[PDB]
Amino acid sequence: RESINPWILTGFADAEGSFLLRIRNNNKSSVGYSTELGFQITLHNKDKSILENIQSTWKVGVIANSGDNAVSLKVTRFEDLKVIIDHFEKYPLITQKLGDYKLFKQAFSVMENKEHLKENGIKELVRIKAKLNWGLTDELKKAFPENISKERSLINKNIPNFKWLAGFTSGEGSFSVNLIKSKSKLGVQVQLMFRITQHIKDKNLMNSLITYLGCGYINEYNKSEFSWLSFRVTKFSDINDKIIPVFQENTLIGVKLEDFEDWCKVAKLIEEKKHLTESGLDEIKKIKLNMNKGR
DNA sequence: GGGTTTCCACTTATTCAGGCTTTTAG
DNA sequence: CCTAAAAGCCTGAATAAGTGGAAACC
Ligand SMILES: [Ca+2]
Ligand SMILES: [Ca+2]
Ligand SMILES: [Ca+2]
């Protein structure tokens, strides 16, 4: 249908994408293992069009259901990985995921030489997989008895432009209408809240948003050993002047675009002070009920 | 063909999106 | 007093990452 700006796409990839490298026990392979290399995105059913638009932009990839409520785009046809590579050389990732892309490239090169059909190419792929995403299973690591490093170098890069940021925010942002039980006349303060969420491994990136957007602050949270960061803007002046124009100018994708649009309607109400009238409050309550999970 | 690649159904792990209420600033 | 802003709390699930099975292809 519609095609996606290449930096918007990279941003969305930084947010939602995943590189994959399968090294599979296989009785029929001359070396006892077969491989599969690729890139994939899994979204809620409601955002299938993003997947289809990505498929259209690159002209690669297979779309399929992923359980009852999700759908995926997977690219594993080896020739088509050349497209993935060319895209991310001209429009590179900036989160720690770049590290996974660099490993995907190393694995691509081994397979391009057909070395994965030989002991030494398989061994090499196990060394690559060992640093990729969640690394080797215990079964695979006991099968290749050699000291295999699990570390790679931290990525540290800057937001390259607003188009990447709109792609990334299309993945990781949220636009909240926070209805606060307040001591004022109407009894409800209306608070617009923009947030961007992301694992701590990319702290430097999340801290940069403060200066990159000239507003906001960051909260840290965890569930047991699992920590992440939350970039939040709540000052209406920053919302209206700094957040909203960025994304009016750099268009979000997916149903999150509708949420931002509803959020902007509420912004206009606030700017006109109608959030201080019972009838404006009613409309704002009705916008909220129908955005995000209520859509 | 016998190996190898590709696709499809489905699962598992966790990092997100994004819900609240109460307190302070101005 | 009054409204805006920030402090401060939370977890279900949409993501991330992955696996089993087998058809299709070279
Ligand atoms: Ca992400
Ligand atoms: Ca998302
Ligand atoms: Ca499961």
Write the CB contacts of A154 (distance below 8 Å, at least 6 apart in sequence): A96, A99
Tokens 């918007």 found at: A8
Cα separation, A108 vs A82, in Å, equals 9
Q: Which nucleotide is nearest to A64 (CA to C1')?
A: B8
d(CA A273, CA A7): 37
Residue span(s) of chain A under CATH 3.10.28.10 come to 6-142, 162-294
Q: Between the CA of A194 and the C1' of C8, what is the distance in angstroms?
A: 16
CATH of A6-142, one of 3.10.28.10, 3.40.50.20, 1.20.58.100, 3.30.2290.10: 3.10.28.10
Report the SS3 class of residue A38.
Answer: strand
Q: Which two tokens stand for residue A19?
A: 């590189």
Cβ A154 vs Cβ A240: under 8 Å: no
**CB A7 within 8 Å of CB A160:** yes
Question: CA-based angle A39:A42:A45, to the nearest 5?
Answer: 145
From residues 183-222 of A, list those within 7 angstroms of strand C by Cβ.
Answer: 183-186, 189-191, 217, 219, 221
CB-proximal positions of chain C, under 7 Å: 2-20
Experimental method, per PDB record = X-ray
Which class is A162-294 in CATH? alpha beta
DSSP A281: H
Q: How far apart (Å, rounded) are the C-alpha atoms in residues A295 and A144? A: 50
